[PDB]
Structure 1
């Protein structure tokens, strides 16, 4: 079972002895520190953490003894604060005397603003604020996934709108393929859930259950998929029977959408001779609601897509849409599910545009690019102390490294407000109390072991919408 006493960086076990004597308050905040890309971030994921790890009775006698025994060997010494944790158990029935204020999940906030704050509600538990820094900082991941996913939606929206004149099917244009390419099962659920803030297509099943448990949707599920082959279901038929494989598969799924990887041996042959000639009759007979979706999976992502499109364009009846862009017949589509990240996604859609192909024709699948190739330094997600009370006196604290002004932290009690022009501003040094910027936009989401405010997955999605989607009014 999880033990919050064992869920922090080792050195933090020793920090209680390091604060100035008579410290009664430690106050800390989390921001996506400012540095041309990623100017605004989607705040998402804290609610998961609060519910799974921080709420209720997270301290027991058994957990204290367990931590005590581990740390004695781990430090080769008795530095573990047994007394502090026993106080929490006895005084608060194992509930954390902590208050956390945060912006609503789904909110899109410019870099450099306070996103959440943490402070102890009991003087005895001054040391507790930064004990849970490590676990709270992991919110960087759902935040970064949601933001990076949304940034890709922006690109897709722009090119779909330009090449087709609408945003139909936008929420199915970037599909989650990252299940095998992430570092764990838990990461898979968290990351997939973060992607679903922006899209509805996912193969990472783990995301569904997490959303249902911690967030909730009106609909039965937040994400969807359709049948598709893998290399094993093609190659198993033997190299000489790839056509037999294709025919069986499209026949088994004749009335629903089906995607078929076509690069096991020769993508260009499979498109031109097998799909385009041998099995063409089984494709042109398919309903608009059940297209064949051809998936290339190798080579240069842009070059392969362009060639595949030129091939299908010569074997199938291509139309020209109202914007002048070429469109495959509605029973035929393409998905590129290899080598896709935010950079290559941009290169492909731009390349398609230059060759007069509508983005209607294509969908994208992304795995490691979507869920694994992200770090905490992408958005500079950072947790710092800004305010302490020692000897009854409030002190505004901060770091300001001489060789890196970018690592400067904010001072004093923080608050988030609207500016007269409708933008966000973070106020420091308790200045929010002056009431010149209206009310603090942060909400208390956690206090004394209880989750005091939460958001449905439907509300989060609403909060995270694009302006171009909002401009459908």
Structure 2
């Protein structure tokens, strides 16, 4: 079973011995430090609070386990048994910590306080930074939610330009990343962050995480459609690709179906198999049940443009009100190979240049890290001998790693923007009310958001 006492960086076990003696308060904060990606979607802390931090997280058994493990790990006794026993005895294993945070789904410029953490009992001054490691992992859903919002902005721009509207934007970037992430847990978290922005997903795990920790009015937050993979085409044999295609589109004749078409020759498949041999089975399909042709190899832009040029000559194309070419409603394309934010941008611009509407295409979804948005957790205020002091790092060779000082608060500016106030200056009351809310206190979650509210908070300006 999960043990919070074994869920921290090893050296943090030794930190209670390193703070100034008579320290009663340690106060720390998380930011996406300021140096593309000028604003971040704050998302994912609520999962962490609920799965790992709330309730009786300390037991006699868990304390003994940590004692035994650290004894071998450090080859010495350095584990703070007494401190954890205090929390067990005094608070029935609930963490005497208060966490304040911006609402989930909030879109906030870099360099602002997003959450703060402090101990609520003088005896547990060491606890604030013990849980740094776990809370810092929020960088992942934040960065994923953020990156996908940025992709949506690009898609929205180009769909609006080529079509005159945003219809179907939420299905334009489908999550196919399940097998490409590092773990099952990561699959659920990352997919949920994707679903903040889009509705189309092949990663089931996202749906369950959302239902358990956030909640939606609807039965599910995300949807998929039948689709082929290379094995369901190749199993038929190299000479029977046409047979595979006919069987699949016939099995899925009244729902949308995606069919990977590059097993052997994408261009032949589009022009001769779909565009000739099986054409009668495609033109007869309903607008609610299109064939979605999926190329999956080659240069992403060149392949997409050639696939469209091929289909344009085999199927009736219209020109929409904005002047852009549009395939018939029973025929679409999905490109899910090598689509990152850069390649996404190159494809939609390339399509636009060739007078193809973004209506025609969807994308399928990569190496995001903690340094991308500079997600960082730092101590900014401590009380020692009853005196509060503002603390910070400011390394000489890197001004960008300078941290914020003292008690922090988040405020609306007179122009309606965000500003973080340092050194407890929030208390001067010149900038109105703190925009952070208490989300966790003494083992309990004190404020939470539905996934529906999170989606509303994360909307694009163009959608509003």
TM-score range, shorter chain: over 0.9
Aligned length in residues: 464
Q: Report Cα offsets for 1:58-112 as digits up to 9, x if no partner.
A: 0000000000000000000000000000000000000000000000000000000
* Offset from partner CA, 1:39-63 (integer Å, 9 cap, x none): 0000000000000000000000000
C-alpha displacement at 1:468, in angstroms? Answer: 0.4
The alpha carbon displacement at 1:132 in A equals: 0.1
Give 5+ residue unaligned stretches, structure 2: none
Structure 1 Cα separation of the partners of residues 291 and 203 of structure 2 = 22
Question: How many Å separate the matches in 1 of 2:212 and 2:378?
Answer: 30
Structure 1 residues 54-133: aligned runs within 5 Å: 54-133=53-132
Instruction: Indicate the residue corresponding to 2:251 in structure 1.
Output: 252
- C-alpha distance in structure 2 between counterparts of 1:296 and 1:6, whole Å: 46
Partner Cα distance (1:397, 1:237) in 2: 67
- Structure 1 residue 142: Cα displacement: 0.2
Other structure's SS at 2:463 match: helix
Q: Classify the secondary structure of the residue corresponding to 2:377.
A: strand
Distance in 2 between the 1:415 and 1:49 partners?
A: 22
- CA distance in 1 between counterparts of 2:367 and 2:222 reads 22
SS at match of 2:90: helix
Query: Partners in 2 of 1:420 and 1:308 — Cα distance?
Result: 52
Displacement of 1:333:
0.2
State the distance in 1 between where 2:94 and 2:205 align. Answer: 29
Q: Matches of 2:117 and 2:275 in 1, distance apart? A: 61
Q: C-alpha displacement at 1:30, in angstroms?
A: 0.1
The superposition leaves residues 279-304 of structure 1 with CA deviations (integer Å, 9 ceiling, x where unpaired) of 00000000000000000000000000
> Cα distance, 1:154 vs. partner?
0.1
How far apart, in 2, do the equivalents of 1:123 and 1:177 lie? 48
Deviation at 1:373, TM superposition (A): 1.2
**CA distance in structure 2 between the partners assigned to 1:120 and 1:262 by the alignment:** 58
Paired residue for 1:369? none
Please state if 1:283 is matched with 2:277: no
Deviations 1:327-349 (A, max 9, x none): 00000000001110001000000
Alpha-carbon RMSD across the aligned residues, in angstroms, is 0.3
Q: Give per-residue Cα distances to partners, 1:222-247, cap 9 Å, x unaligned.
A: 00000000000000000000000000
| CA shift for structure 1 position 21 | 0.3
- Secondary structure at 1:52's aligned position in 2? helix
Residue 452 of structure 1: aligned partner: 446
Secondary structure at 1:232 match in 2: helix
Question: Tell me, what secondary structure is at the counterpart of 1:117?
Answer: strand
1:136 shift after superposition: 0.1
Aligned to 1:33: 33
- SS across alignment from 1:180: helix
Distance 1:345 1:403 in 2: 36
Q: 1:376 aligns with which of 370, 373, 379?
A: 370
Match of 2:41 in 1: 42
Runs of 4+ aligned structure 1 residues displaced above 4 Å come to none
Following superposition, the deviation at residue 356 of structure 1 comes to 0.4
Query: In structure 2, what is the Cα distance between the partners aligned to 1:307 and 1:65?
Result: 64
Between the aligned partners of 1:446 and 1:287, the Cα distance in structure 2 is 51
CA deviation after TM superposition for structure 1 residue 404, in Å: 0.2
Q: Secondary structure at the match of 1:386?
A: strand
Shift of 1:18: 0.2
Offset of 1:139 from its aligned partner? 0.1
Instruction: Please give the TM-score of this superposition, normalised by the length of structure 1.
Output: 0.98
Query: Cα distance, 1:385 vs. partner?
Result: 0.1
Query: Hey, what's the Cα distance between the residues in 2 that align with 1:373 and 1:353?
Result: 27
Deviation per CA, 1:193-241, whole angstroms, max 9, x where unpaired? 0000000001000000000000000000000000000000000000000
Q: TM-score, normalized by length of structure 2?
A: 1.00
Q: 1:310-389 alignment to 2 at 5 Å? A: 310-366=309-365, 372-389=366-383
Report the equivalent of 2:272. Answer: 273
